[PDB]
Design an enzyme around this catalytic site. Structure first.
Site, PDB file in Angstrom:
ATOM      1  N   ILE A  51       0.791  -1.241   0.000  1.00  0.00           N
ATOM      2  CA  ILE A  51       0.000   0.000   0.000  1.00  0.00           C
ATOM      3  C   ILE A  51       0.819   1.286   0.000  1.00  0.00           C
ATOM      4  O   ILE A  51       0.243   2.367  -0.104  1.00  0.00           O
ATOM      5  CB  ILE A  51      -1.061   0.014   1.122  1.00  0.00           C
ATOM      6  CG1 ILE A  51      -0.456  -0.183   2.513  1.00  0.00           C
ATOM      7  CG2 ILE A  51      -2.089  -1.078   0.859  1.00  0.00           C
ATOM      8  CD1 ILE A  51      -1.457  -0.142   3.648  1.00  0.00           C
ATOM      9  N   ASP A 100       8.219  18.860   8.631  1.00  0.00           N
ATOM     10  CA  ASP A 100       7.928  18.454   7.257  1.00  0.00           C
ATOM     11  C   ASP A 100       6.498  17.920   7.134  1.00  0.00           C
ATOM     12  O   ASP A 100       6.241  16.896   6.509  1.00  0.00           O
ATOM     13  CB  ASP A 100       8.967  17.443   6.745  1.00  0.00           C
ATOM     14  CG  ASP A 100       8.963  17.319   5.205  1.00  0.00           C
ATOM     15  OD1 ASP A 100       8.548  18.268   4.479  1.00  0.00           O
ATOM     16  OD2 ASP A 100       9.349  16.238   4.723  1.00  0.00           O
ATOM     17  N   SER A 145       5.238   3.039  -0.589  1.00  0.00           N
ATOM     18  CA  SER A 145       6.706   2.976  -0.537  1.00  0.00           C
ATOM     19  C   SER A 145       7.351   4.358  -0.640  1.00  0.00           C
ATOM     20  O   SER A 145       6.751   5.317  -1.147  1.00  0.00           O
ATOM     21  CB  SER A 145       7.256   2.103  -1.668  1.00  0.00           C
ATOM     22  OG  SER A 145       6.962   2.696  -2.907  1.00  0.00           O
ATOM     23  N   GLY A 146       8.592   4.439  -0.191  1.00  0.00           N
ATOM     24  CA  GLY A 146       9.357   5.682  -0.255  1.00  0.00           C
ATOM     25  C   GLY A 146      10.671   5.497   0.463  1.00  0.00           C
ATOM     26  O   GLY A 146      10.728   4.781   1.474  1.00  0.00           O
ATOM     27  N   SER A 192      13.878   3.735   1.249  1.00  0.00           N
ATOM     28  CA  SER A 192      14.113   2.286   1.183  1.00  0.00           C
ATOM     29  C   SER A 192      13.114   1.572   2.099  1.00  0.00           C
ATOM     30  O   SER A 192      13.476   0.732   2.927  1.00  0.00           O
ATOM     31  CB  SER A 192      15.563   1.950   1.554  1.00  0.00           C
ATOM     32  OG  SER A 192      15.837   2.278   2.903  1.00  0.00           O
ATOM     33  N   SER A 193      11.845   1.930   1.945  1.00  0.00           N
ATOM     34  CA  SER A 193      10.785   1.319   2.738  1.00  0.00           C
ATOM     35  C   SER A 193       9.518   1.008   1.942  1.00  0.00           C
ATOM     36  O   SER A 193       9.256   1.556   0.875  1.00  0.00           O
ATOM     37  CB  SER A 193      10.474   2.153   3.999  1.00  0.00           C
ATOM     38  OG  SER A 193      10.286   3.512   3.699  1.00  0.00           O
ATOM     39  N   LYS A 194       8.757   0.082   2.492  1.00  0.00           N
ATOM     40  CA  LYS A 194       7.540  -0.417   1.866  1.00  0.00           C
ATOM     41  C   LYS A 194       6.524  -0.577   2.942  1.00  0.00           C
ATOM     42  O   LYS A 194       6.879  -0.857   4.100  1.00  0.00           O
ATOM     43  CB  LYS A 194       7.791  -1.783   1.237  1.00  0.00           C
ATOM     44  CG  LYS A 194       8.773  -1.791   0.079  1.00  0.00           C
ATOM     45  CD  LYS A 194       8.759  -3.161  -0.585  1.00  0.00           C
ATOM     46  CE  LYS A 194      10.006  -3.431  -1.415  1.00  0.00           C
ATOM     47  NZ  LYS A 194      10.225  -2.351  -2.416  1.00  0.00           N
ATOM     48  N   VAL A 195       5.260  -0.408   2.573  1.00  0.00           N
ATOM     49  CA  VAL A 195       4.153  -0.590   3.530  1.00  0.00           C
ATOM     50  C   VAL A 195       3.207  -1.631   2.970  1.00  0.00           C
ATOM     51  O   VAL A 195       2.837  -1.561   1.797  1.00  0.00           O
ATOM     52  CB  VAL A 195       3.395   0.712   3.811  1.00  0.00           C
ATOM     53  CG1 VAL A 195       2.286   0.466   4.845  1.00  0.00           C
ATOM     54  CG2 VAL A 195       4.382   1.764   4.322  1.00  0.00           C
ATOM     55  N   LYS A 235       5.108  -1.668   8.167  1.00  0.00           N
ATOM     56  CA  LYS A 235       6.070  -0.787   7.539  1.00  0.00           C
ATOM     57  C   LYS A 235       7.403  -1.492   7.633  1.00  0.00           C
ATOM     58  O   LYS A 235       7.827  -1.902   8.717  1.00  0.00           O
ATOM     59  CB  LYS A 235       6.102   0.558   8.234  1.00  0.00           C
ATOM     60  CG  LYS A 235       7.036   1.636   7.670  1.00  0.00           C
ATOM     61  CD  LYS A 235       6.695   2.925   8.430  1.00  0.00           C
ATOM     62  CE  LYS A 235       7.585   4.109   8.088  1.00  0.00           C
ATOM     63  NZ  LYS A 235       6.845   5.374   8.390  1.00  0.00           N
TER      64      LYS A 235
HETATM   65  C1  C5N Z   1       4.400   9.687   5.229  1.00  0.00           C
HETATM   66  C2  C5N Z   1       5.054   8.868   6.310  1.00  0.00           C
HETATM   67  C3  C5N Z   1       6.226   8.029   5.857  1.00  0.00           C
HETATM   68  C4  C5N Z   1       7.529   8.488   6.062  1.00  0.00           C
HETATM   69  C5  C5N Z   1       8.624   7.747   5.674  1.00  0.00           C
HETATM   70  C6  C5N Z   1       8.440   6.523   5.070  1.00  0.00           C
HETATM   71  C7  C5N Z   1       7.161   6.009   4.845  1.00  0.00           C
HETATM   72  C8  C5N Z   1       7.001   4.661   4.183  1.00  0.00           C
HETATM   73  C9  C5N Z   1       6.745   4.725   2.702  1.00  0.00           C
HETATM   74  C10 C5N Z   1       6.065   6.792   5.224  1.00  0.00           C
HETATM   75  N1  C5N Z   1       4.747   6.271   5.034  1.00  0.00           N
HETATM   76  C11 C5N Z   1       4.109   5.457   5.910  1.00  0.00           C
HETATM   77  O1  C5N Z   1       4.580   5.114   6.994  1.00  0.00           O
HETATM   78  C12 C5N Z   1       2.789   4.968   5.491  1.00  0.00           C
HETATM   79  N2  C5N Z   1       2.378   5.137   4.244  1.00  0.00           N
HETATM   80  N3  C5N Z   1       1.132   4.585   4.164  1.00  0.00           N
HETATM   81  C13 C5N Z   1       0.391   4.590   2.913  1.00  0.00           C
HETATM   82  C14 C5N Z   1       0.789   4.067   5.367  1.00  0.00           C
HETATM   83  C15 C5N Z   1       1.833   4.309   6.229  1.00  0.00           C
HETATM   84  C16 C5N Z   1       1.781   3.904   7.672  1.00  0.00           C
HETATM   85  C17 C5N Z   1       0.634   2.952   8.001  1.00  0.00           C
HETATM   86  C18 C5N Z   1      -0.542   2.882   7.051  1.00  0.00           C
HETATM   87  C19 C5N Z   1      -1.800   2.248   7.405  1.00  0.00           C
HETATM   88  N4  C5N Z   1      -2.809   2.199   6.555  1.00  0.00           N
HETATM   89  C20 C5N Z   1      -2.612   2.733   5.326  1.00  0.00           C
HETATM   90  N5  C5N Z   1      -3.627   2.688   4.421  1.00  0.00           N
HETATM   91  C21 C5N Z   1      -3.633   3.089   3.061  1.00  0.00           C
HETATM   92  C22 C5N Z   1      -3.084   4.307   2.662  1.00  0.00           C
HETATM   93  C23 C5N Z   1      -3.098   4.664   1.334  1.00  0.00           C
HETATM   94  C24 C5N Z   1      -3.672   3.824   0.375  1.00  0.00           C
HETATM   95  N6  C5N Z   1      -3.675   4.172  -0.991  1.00  0.00           N
HETATM   96  C25 C5N Z   1      -3.413   3.141  -2.004  1.00  0.00           C
HETATM   97  C26 C5N Z   1      -2.631   3.663  -3.188  1.00  0.00           C
HETATM   98  N7  C5N Z   1      -3.214   4.903  -3.704  1.00  0.00           N
HETATM   99  C27 C5N Z   1      -2.521   5.355  -4.914  1.00  0.00           C
HETATM  100  C28 C5N Z   1      -3.158   5.920  -2.651  1.00  0.00           C
HETATM  101  C29 C5N Z   1      -4.010   5.514  -1.473  1.00  0.00           C
HETATM  102  C30 C5N Z   1      -4.222   2.611   0.776  1.00  0.00           C
HETATM  103  C31 C5N Z   1      -4.208   2.229   2.112  1.00  0.00           C
HETATM  104  O2  C5N Z   1      -4.717   1.051   2.575  1.00  0.00           O
HETATM  105  C32 C5N Z   1      -5.352   0.168   1.654  1.00  0.00           C
HETATM  106  N8  C5N Z   1      -1.470   3.342   4.912  1.00  0.00           N
HETATM  107  C33 C5N Z   1      -0.437   3.406   5.769  1.00  0.00           C
END
Ligand code: C5N
Ligand code: CL
Length: 264
Positions: free
Chosen positions: A18, A134, A20-21, A23-26, A40
């Site tokens: 769901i 940020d 990435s960014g 070097s991480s994936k969710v 995460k």
């Molecule tokens: C912005 C914070 C950050 C900083 C550094 C590194 C990362 C990891 C990439 C992050 N990101 C995250 O730590 C993170 N990113 N996502 C999407 C989530 C997290 C933490 C936990 C979490 C829990 N539940 C969800 N649900 C969710 C969110 C978005 C979506 N989408 C799908 C693709 N679309 C194009 C956009 C909308 C779907 C979701 O759930 C099905 N989504 C999430």
């Protein structure tokens, strides 16, 4: 399909990726009892000691601060090694950024509820000496109508490296540009509310990034606040987006502001 992973001995079924960014994936996942979570995954193999420390520091604060507010994302468990971090987190419907992209108009009530949630989460981290610095809509997760702050801005973001609206300056405060204060998070929150009110960030329309940076700092560049039915909302925006951080409104002030308190 049919991938699983283990975190502190517990097996999780992976339904899909769901996010990435860096070097991480969710991952959207299920535990053995078919309860849903987001995992995460952070790849640490290229991380220096400074970066490892920044991740350790963020995990420690997240684990502590979730007990101080329900507007911070839950962290249920984690496994940390030299190669990686797995964080078992609360699952959300969608992040705020993706939600705002889908929606033309936001409901005024919805807008106000989200604002309250953001102020509370951010006020929480400030009370422990953390300035995020940020904040953007992507940092908030929508969980059954409630916003949760996902991160605290402490972890140093690593570069993509591998094959594999990003690094945006639209929420950046004047004082960050001329090269740390809790007032910086107020400007950024103000930019989010401004987006939710007028459908764009205050400086969005300036495509050239050097121009935009100059517009952020230039006190002769007046930010437009067109008239809307909610005059208290108009006042909140104006108070958040003062260029002088000392003149800018504080979070405890925003929490007592009639926009959040007066029963309309
Ligand atoms: C912005 C914070 C950050 C900083 C550094 C590194 C990362 C990891 C990439 C992050 N990101 C995250 O730590 C993170 N990113 N996502 C999407 C989530 C997290 C933490 C936990 C979490 C829990 N539940 C969800 N649900 C969710 C969110 C978005 C979506 N989408 C799908 C693709 N679309 C194009 C956009 C909308 C779907 C979701 O759930 C099905 N989504 C999430
Ligand atoms: Cl709680």
């Amino acid at each position: 399909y049919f991938q699983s992973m283990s975190v502190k001995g517990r097996i999780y079924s992976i339904l899909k990726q769901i996010g990435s960014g860096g070097s991480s994936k969710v991952f959207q996942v299920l535990n053995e009892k078919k309860q849903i979570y987001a995992i995460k995954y952070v790849n640490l193999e290229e991380a220096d000691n400074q970066t490892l420390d920044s991740y350790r520091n963020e995990i420690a604060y997240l684990n502590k601060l979730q007990q101080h507010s329900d507007k911070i994302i839950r962290l249920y468990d984690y496994e940390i090694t030299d190669q990686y971090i797995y964080m078992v987190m609360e699952y959300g419907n969608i992040d705020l950024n993706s939600w705002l992209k889908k929606k033309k108009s936001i409901d005024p009530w919805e807008r106000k509820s989200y604002w309250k949630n953001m102020l509370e989460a951010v006020h929480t981290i400030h009370q422990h000496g953390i300035v995020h610095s940020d904040l953007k809509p992507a940092n908030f997760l929508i969980v059954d109508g409630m916003l949760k702050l996902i991160d605290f801005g402490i972890a140093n973001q690593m570069q993509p490296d591998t094959t594999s609206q990003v690094g945006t300056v639209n929420y950046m405060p004047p004082e960050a540009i001329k090269d740390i204060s809790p007032k910086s998070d107020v400007w950024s929150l103000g930019c989010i509310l401004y987006y939710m009110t007028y459908g764009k960030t205050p400086f969005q329309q300036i495509i050239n990034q050097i121009s935009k940076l100059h517009a952020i700092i230039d006190p002769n560049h007046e930010i437009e606040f067109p008239d809307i039915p909610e005059k208290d909302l108009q006042d909140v925006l104006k108070c958040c987006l003062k260029r002088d951080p000392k003149q800018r409104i504080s979070i405890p002030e925003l929490l007592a502001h009639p926009y959040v308190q007066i029963q309309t």
